[PDB]
Amino acid sequence: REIITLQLGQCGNQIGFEFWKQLCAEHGISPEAIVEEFTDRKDVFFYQYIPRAVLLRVIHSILNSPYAKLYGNNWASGFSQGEKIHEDIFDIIDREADGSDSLEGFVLCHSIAGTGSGLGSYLLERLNDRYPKKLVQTYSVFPVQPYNSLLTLKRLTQNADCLVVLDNTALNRIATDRLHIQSFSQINQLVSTIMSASTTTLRYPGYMNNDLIGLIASLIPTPRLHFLMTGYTPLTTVLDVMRRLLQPKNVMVSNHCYIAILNIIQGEVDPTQVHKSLQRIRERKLANFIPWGPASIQVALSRKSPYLRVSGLMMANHTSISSLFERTCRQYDKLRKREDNFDEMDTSREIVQQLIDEYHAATRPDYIS
Amino acid sequence: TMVSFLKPVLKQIIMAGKSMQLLKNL
Amino acid sequence: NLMQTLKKDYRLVEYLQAMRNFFLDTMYDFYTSIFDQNVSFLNVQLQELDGLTLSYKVPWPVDIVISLECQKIYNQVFLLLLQIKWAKYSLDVLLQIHRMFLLRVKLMHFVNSLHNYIMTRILHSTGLEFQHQVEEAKDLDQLIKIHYRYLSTIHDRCLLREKVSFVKEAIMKVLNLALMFADGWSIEKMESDFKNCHMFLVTILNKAFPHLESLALS
Numbered sequence: 001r002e003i004i005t006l007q008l009g010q011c012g013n014q015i016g017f018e019f020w021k022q023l024c025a026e027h028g029i030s031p032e033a034i035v036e037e038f039t040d041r042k043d044v045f046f047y048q049y050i051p052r053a054v055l056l057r058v059i060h061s062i063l064n065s066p067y068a069k070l071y072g073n074n075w076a077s078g079f080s081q082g083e084k085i086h087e088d089i090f091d092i093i094d095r096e097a098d099g100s101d102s103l104e105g106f107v108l109c110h111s112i113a114g115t116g117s118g119l120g121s122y123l124l125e126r127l128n129d130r131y132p133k134k135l136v137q138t139y140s141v142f143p144v145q146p147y148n149s150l151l152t153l154k155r156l157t158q159n160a161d162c163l164v165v166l167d168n169t170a171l172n173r174i175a176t177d178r179l180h181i182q183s184f185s186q187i188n189q190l191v192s193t194i195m196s197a198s199t200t201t202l203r204y205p206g207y208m209n210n211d212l213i214g215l216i217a218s219l220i221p222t223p224r225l226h227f228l229m230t231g232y233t234p235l236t237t238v239l240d241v242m243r244r245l246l247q248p249k250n251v252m253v254s255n256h257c258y259i260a261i262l263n264i265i266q267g268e269v270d271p272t273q274v275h276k277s278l279q280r281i282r283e284r285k286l287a288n289f290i291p292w293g294p295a296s297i298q299v300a301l302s303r304k305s306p307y308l309r310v311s312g313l314m315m316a317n318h319t320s321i322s323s324l325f326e327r328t329c330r331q332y333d334k335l336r337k338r339e340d341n342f343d344e345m346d347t348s349r350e351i352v353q354q355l356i357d358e359y360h361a362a363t364r365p366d367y368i369s
Numbered sequence: 370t371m372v373s374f375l376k377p378v379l380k381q382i383i384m385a386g387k388s389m390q391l392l393k394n395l
Numbered sequence: 396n397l398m399q400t401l402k403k404d405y406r407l408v409e410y411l412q413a414m415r416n417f418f419l420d421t422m423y424d425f426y427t428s429i430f431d432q433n434v435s436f437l438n439v440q441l442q443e444l445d446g447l448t449l450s451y452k453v454p455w456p457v458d459i460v461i462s463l464e465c466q467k468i469y470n471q472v473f474l475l476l477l478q479i480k481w482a483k484y485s486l487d488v489l490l491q492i493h494r495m496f497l498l499r500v501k502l503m504h505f506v507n508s509l510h511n512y513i514m515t516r517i518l519h520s521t522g523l524e525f526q527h528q529v530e531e532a533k534d535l536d537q538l539i540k541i542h543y544r545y546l547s548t549i550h551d552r553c554l555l556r557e558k559v560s561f562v563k564e565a566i567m568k569v570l571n572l573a574l575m576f577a578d579g580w581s582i583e584k585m586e587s588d589f590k591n592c593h594m595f596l597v598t599i600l601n602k603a604f605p606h607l608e609s610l611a612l613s
């Protein structure tokens with residue numbers, strides 16, 4: 001069961017290529033798509049070796065790299081251009097979808113900050129049309145810009161099966177704090193690490209979590225609340241890791257409570273001490289959950305790439321993500337009264353108001369009704 | 370029915386005798 | 396000398412590692428086909444409510460270690476494990492109207508917590524210790540004992556031997572809630588049962604022998 005990737009716009013093509021760089025660096029696959037001599041099931045993310053990549057100006061830059069063997073600014077502008085090449089790109093998808101034995105998911109790397117946001121809006125409505133049994137996860141990236149952003153939200157609110165926020169501002173913070181840079185070519189170095197470590201349990205088989213649906217649906221309580229945020233502190237026992245993870249200095253997001261926590265441990269840690277670490281997390285109570293539903297914290301063990309030290313990743317569903325929406329939302333109301341139908345923009349503003357109003361009620365002891 | 374002369378080590382004999390018989394067949 | 400020539404050359408140890416691997420990845424695709432029977436249909440699937448007896452072929456040099464009554468115990472834990480993977484996957488493949496979702500998280504949690512307990516805390520704790528023990532094998536006999544002291548203990552931690560109608564049946568009957576609620580896709584009459592059996596589960600397991608507290612939190 002395989003997952004196909006799609007890189008949209010300058011941003012998506014940038015973040016995916018670097019992610020494909022490190023992923024090919026972790027695996028024992030030389031840059032020339034030829035196996036190196038020098039345990040890993042790689043049929044999900046590789047075809048016998050050519051990646052199942054769908055790239056969409058930067059194309060020249062990708063070809064100029066030695067990895068050539070591995071294959072306006074309006075939102076409405078992107079929406080129109082997508083219908084123009086409707087069958088042009090979907091034949092590439094269909095030749096690979098039907099070319100794939102049993103497709104499992106749809107990962108998307110795109111920035112909603114110009115044309116990729118419009119084209120990305122086109123893919124979501126289109127992918128739900130044809131494929132009704134296919135997972136759609138989007139690794140969207142956040143920051144005239146309020147307009148393009150809010151529309152992609154309206155599309156992402158009901159089309160995508162999941163969502164992982166990646167805001168540039170919080171990423172800009174880590175760029176100076178622990179790296180001392182002030183660059184686009186440098187912030188993505190963390191994004192690739194975030195992406196690669198996210199799917200480690202799928203590329204290196206273990207006992208639990210042998211499918212992407214196995215990871216996400218433990219977090220998402222209801223299809224409306226399908227927004228996630230991540231954590232990656234290591235930049236030492238199992239207790240040292242998780243406590244470093246709950247510090248808001250590390251969360252990639254710029255009352256409130258969590259929904260569920262999933263943790264990834266890639267080191268050589270011992271499975272004797274993990275169940276006790278959860279206890280000290282509960283006793284010391286460094287986090288609160290929903291008052292209605294009994295929430296749990298999950299953590300999985302994995303194996304680091306031998307072809308490449310204890311590291312870890314955290315996935316979260318935190319209701320504090322509502323504040324991020326309200327900012328652009330306020331920014332929309334700002335330019336709306338400040339400056340052929342202009343009616344769809346109001347429909348987008350209505351639906352995104354619903355989701356936020358559900359967040360604030362999601363953290364109450366009466367979430368029922 | 371057993372002489373206690375070699376009892377304190379008898380277990381190490383049988384476990385060596387039978388284990389040896391399975392070696393010559395291999 | 397015997398143990399030395401037994402690491403390779405009728406590699407009994409290599410065969411043992413594969414044994415506990417082809418069950419307890421690969422076996423994910425196998426069961427998923429069974430979700431959506433025939434006795435020959437399965438074989439081609441494998442070579443690619445409580446039955447499915449599985450066996451294996453062992454050469455004489457290792458026959459004395461992996462005995463015949465040893466296959467059944469390895470089969471015993473495999474049967475029960477699948478029912479957990481079943482309920483875990485059945486409540487996972489899908490995605491007062493929304494009130495059903497509150498019955499999902501209130502349940503998809505509980506089966507998920509149990510699965511995290513049997514596999515990680517038991518089927519991987521004793522497994523990590525067992526390998527560190529066999530690599531120091533120095534005898535024909537004691538290799539049986541260190542092995543037989545691995546099943547008869549893993550059959551006890553995973554509660555399947557005794558106290559079945561006292562404790563094990565409770566987990567078994569609430570597992571039927573994972574089947575009934577899966578098909579329907581009366582609602583009020585489920586939580587009255589669910590909040591009862593789950594409280595019945597804790598108010599019975601409360602007698603805790605000591606390792607049961609690792610799950611007693613929920």
Ligand SMILES: Nc1nc2c(ncn2[C@@H]2O[C@H](COP(=O)(O)OP(=O)(O)O)[C@@H](O)[C@H]2O)c(=O)[nH]1
Pocket residue numbers: 008009010011014015072073111113114115116117141143168171184185187188
């Ligand atoms: N964090 C990060 N953001 C990027 C990168 N490249 C582009 N972006 C963002 O993408 C936005 C511009 O997207 P754009 O190039 O117009 O997409 P296009 O219209 O489809 O070509 C800007 O607001 C940037 O913040 C990158 O490497 N890292």
